[PDB]
Amino acid sequence: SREQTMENILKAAKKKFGERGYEGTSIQEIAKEAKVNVAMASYYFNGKENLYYEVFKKYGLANELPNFLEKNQFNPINALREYLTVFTTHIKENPEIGTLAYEEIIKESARLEKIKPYFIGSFEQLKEILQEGEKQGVFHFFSINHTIHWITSIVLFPKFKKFIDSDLVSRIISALTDK
Amino acid sequence: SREQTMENILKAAKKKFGERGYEGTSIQEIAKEAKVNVAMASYYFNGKENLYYEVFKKYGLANELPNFLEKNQFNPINALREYLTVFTTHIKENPEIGTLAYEEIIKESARLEKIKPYFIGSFEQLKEILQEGEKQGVFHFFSINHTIHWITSIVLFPKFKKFIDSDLVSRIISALTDK
């Protein structure tokens, strides 16, 4: 069926886009990887750019993410522990956010507005947790922005952690709570 | 002459690699951009991978970077001011470090060891300045690592600054000196 095929194409697309980035990947490489022809792939998704958006729309974590504050009765340490655990485990297991979050959030712009709706929640929530923590007097920081900056970096990019340095959840909590 | 031609190819390569990343760019695209043929390009640089290293070796800033501490008589504020100014101006004017520092330092590994020698000095120096500042009691921070993490991010990636937030040298100095 068209839908099942489209699921196979998306899986192939996550892989190739994760490898080469948007501008580095052709619909042909994805079609080859999916064992379908280009015209079919292009028809089903209405082109490479929509196919790319569909990868975020299918594999983006935000849509199915619980509200961690609410789930933890607004305990900002428990909420943050749960949030970081959910993230670090998923990111190591799927390092196609490594390349694609970098390209689109960190470096760039062109397609930004189209994909934002699929990662901005993850950031809005981290911000909520840090600010609820600050409000409750348990977290301390100069800039919410830099804190967001540095938490993101060390979570998304564990090999850059290595480059510098040369578990993580508890390390982040300890940094935040220090006075 | 072979050398002049190679300079034209390198300029073309900085551009295309900056656009599409290593795995996203072919020697053919660079050859086309340079108005030479592929065999010549490939012969002159001994292949795409060496050509890539040559881009770092030619456009990497570290090799011609002064020692900012020494230049500023070991005043860590003046040194850091000068270091950040040199960096932010060069990075905005050449956003082919944006993509290539991300790909190689931040995300990845494969070719890491080959290119490190061409950016590790920039990081070693920032570290020196921050630590000399800390030693002299003027800079205050929990983790030298996170500080390196967050300074890098907001300097390299000004559009991610915007995504979050939604001049810089003085902002960084002020964050560091606060107690």
Author numbering:
A (entry chain A), B (entry chain A): 4 to 169, 186 to 198
According to the publication:
The polypeptide chain of HlyIIR contains 201 amino acid residues and has a molecular mass of 23.5 kDa. The hemolysin II regulator gene, hlyIIR, is located immediately downstream of hlyII and its product regulates hlyII expression by specifically binding to a 44 bp perfect inverted DNA repeat (22 bp × 2), centred 48 bp upstream of the hlyII transcription initiation point. HlyIIR negatively regulates expression from the hlyII promoter in heterologous system in Escherichia coli cells. In general, the N-terminal domain of HlyIIR exhibits high sequence homology to members of the TetR family while its C-terminal portion appears to be divergent.
In the final model refined at 2.4 Å resolution all residues are within the most favoured and additionally allowed regions of the Ramachandran plot, with all stereochemical values within or better than the expected range. The model contains 179 amino acid residues (Ser4–Lys198) except for a segment of 16 residues (Leu170–Glu185) for which there was no clear electron density. In the crystal structure, the biological dimer is generated by the crystallographic 2-fold axis. The dimer of HlyIIR has an Ω shape, typical for the TetR family of repressors, with overall dimensions of about 60 Å × 60 Å × 25 Å. HlyIIR has an all α-fold, with each subunit consisting of nine α-helices. A monomer of HlyIIR can be subdivided into a small N-terminal DNA-binding domain and a larger C-terminal dimerisation domain. An important feature of the HlyIIR structure is a large internal cavity in the C-terminal α-helical bundle. This cavity is 18 Å long and has an internal volume of ∼ 550 Å3. Most of the inner surface of the cavity is lined by 25 hydrophobic residues contributed by helices α4–α8. The presence of this large cavity and analogy with the structural homologues suggest that DNA-binding properties of HlyIIR are modulated by interactions with a small-molecule ligand.
